[PDB]
Nucleic acid binder design. Sequence first.
DNA 1: TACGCAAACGTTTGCGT
DNA 2: TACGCAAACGTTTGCGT
Lengths: 339, 339
Amino acid sequence: ATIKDVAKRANVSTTTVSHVINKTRFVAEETRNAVWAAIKELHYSPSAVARSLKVNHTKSIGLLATSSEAAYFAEIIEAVEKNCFQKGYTLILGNAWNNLEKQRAYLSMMAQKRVDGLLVMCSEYPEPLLAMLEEYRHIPMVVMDWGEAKADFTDAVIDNAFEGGYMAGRYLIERGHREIGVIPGPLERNTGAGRLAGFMKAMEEAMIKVPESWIVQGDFEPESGYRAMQQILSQPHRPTAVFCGGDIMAMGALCAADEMGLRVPQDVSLIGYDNVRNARYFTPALTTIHQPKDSLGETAFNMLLDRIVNKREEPQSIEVHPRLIERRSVADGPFRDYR
Amino acid sequence: ATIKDVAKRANVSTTTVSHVINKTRFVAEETRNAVWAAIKELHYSPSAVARSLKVNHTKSIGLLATSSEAAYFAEIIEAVEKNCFQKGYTLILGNAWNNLEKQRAYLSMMAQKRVDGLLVMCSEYPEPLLAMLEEYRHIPMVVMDWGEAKADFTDAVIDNAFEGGYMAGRYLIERGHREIGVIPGPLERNTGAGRLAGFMKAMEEAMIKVPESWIVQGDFEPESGYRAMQQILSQPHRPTAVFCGGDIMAMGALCAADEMGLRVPQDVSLIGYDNVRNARYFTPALTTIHQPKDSLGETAFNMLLDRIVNKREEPQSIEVHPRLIERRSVADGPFRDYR
DNA sequence: TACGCAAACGTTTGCGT
DNA sequence: TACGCAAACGTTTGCGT
Ligand code: HPA
Ligand code: HPA
């Protein structure tokens, strides 16, 4: 039950039991064995609580997420978790659903549980949230979802969402389109506003004007893709191509088109963004901008461990890069031959 | 920094600080305030480690999962998490990927971290795993993925996967089909073998014989749905309808059909299972058996808390029930008018 | 050579007066 | 009335001899 119970069965001091258990000093074989034996019948399981109390670190990390079911998110989380495990850390998952109160709560429970570091993925960063976060500059942390380093008291991994938005637009332009519409994600997020603007730069470069009736705000959820695609194609004049800010929303856009009798890409070309695991099996196989979700995770974890173990003080930031994945949802547009 | 530092700034004993902080006894207003004030400048955050060491419970639960990205899983996890939070518990997520070693590791780290209870979702339960689990009968636990109560030392929530398999088959039969094929999930799992057998009972009842070339094993992953659908339709004689053991695999089956030029449901009818959040937005909107994922989570959490707080000793088991969701992937079969 | 003493980590709580 | 003493929870680790 307790180290004391073990030391006693083994007839050695607890100081000894602890040394064999942690190979922190040489112990006579025979001695070791005895301890192991006792450890065994006693069915001892050392208390990490006790230990952490003395050693001052819990070997545990907290993820302050937005939600965890959304494919995008879910893929990152599973990555972060992979890393913790292989480096002996334990993951504490907390979804704040973009709720300040919730954020304030989890943040606290976390601090109380004395997590060695914090991985932050809150989507939106209002001042109040930015404020609560600084109050914990003491806990080592890294934000994995900004496009620029919003603050000095944290590490940051940046996705170059603007560059990707730009890649998306260029591709459409290079395929022959000039009448393009867009369904962006929330402008309050990096993956929302960022991708959009990247996209819009390329349009401007090509002197392509995007009429406002062709821009419909989504929320990364499929229903939102569904309604937007519908509002776009449900009009007199419709674009020949659509840039959809997120794969899952795109999936929604695909379904509406089909329900309206439109053909993809024969009638409308569709390009998404994220390259979630199932994008290839959408119907038709989705052409999209890939976000390195795995590296985003691993890179974030690593910066954390650094700050952790190597007691780093300076905020760091590391970029990651998106890349176009051609599938079958895009077709040449009316101006292809003219380039 | 420490309770001691607070008691001192406040000029009261720590016994006092602790009482205000936990409202465990009456404290003079003025006294309270002082403590709060100190608590404030000191920027104190009570140590849960310390506390748990004394009180003997961590207010934290461990989820020994298989993986967390798969839509099915991801939806359950997000539910379990919702429950922990509203009941003040902290969630420790651990994916064992159906690996014994991994299982043995997480199980241990968990025990060491002294989690108040364990939510188990390992998919497959080989004796060796069944064995490791009993070694921890001491920690309160519930398995959320068996179809029958595999053991006495745990609580269990059962999904009635056989009943659902049977619902799926019946529907096809009632729609006019007699040439049906099936892509089941791994037979080593409840959601695999269970659904299949439910399905097969209905066939037998209808004297429908399922030729072996029409049964293709999947693994819940879309690629597997893709290959299987392909092997099924890639043959001389093909069924008019397909029962697909999991939505995500179904999504794969949908894509292959389209790629082979087949029409759903015009050429082939397809019925899935799970009713994952995006099934409605598949193309076409997927007809499937719904698994109450939310209730599965909440129900499991609740049984745990019970055993926890009410120190229950007896293994319990609670059933949950699936229900058919008609969408647009099924059409009447050749024998409809003949019934 | 190989191991043990005892203090400390940060809290909570029975008995007090 | 309203608060404090001090022991304990389960470990780790400096100094020993
Ligand atoms: O905020 C988001 N939510 C879901 N999917 C996403 N893909 C990019 N950003 C997001
Ligand atoms: O084991 C499974 N994996 C993924 N999805 C599933 N849906 C039912 N069972 C499963």
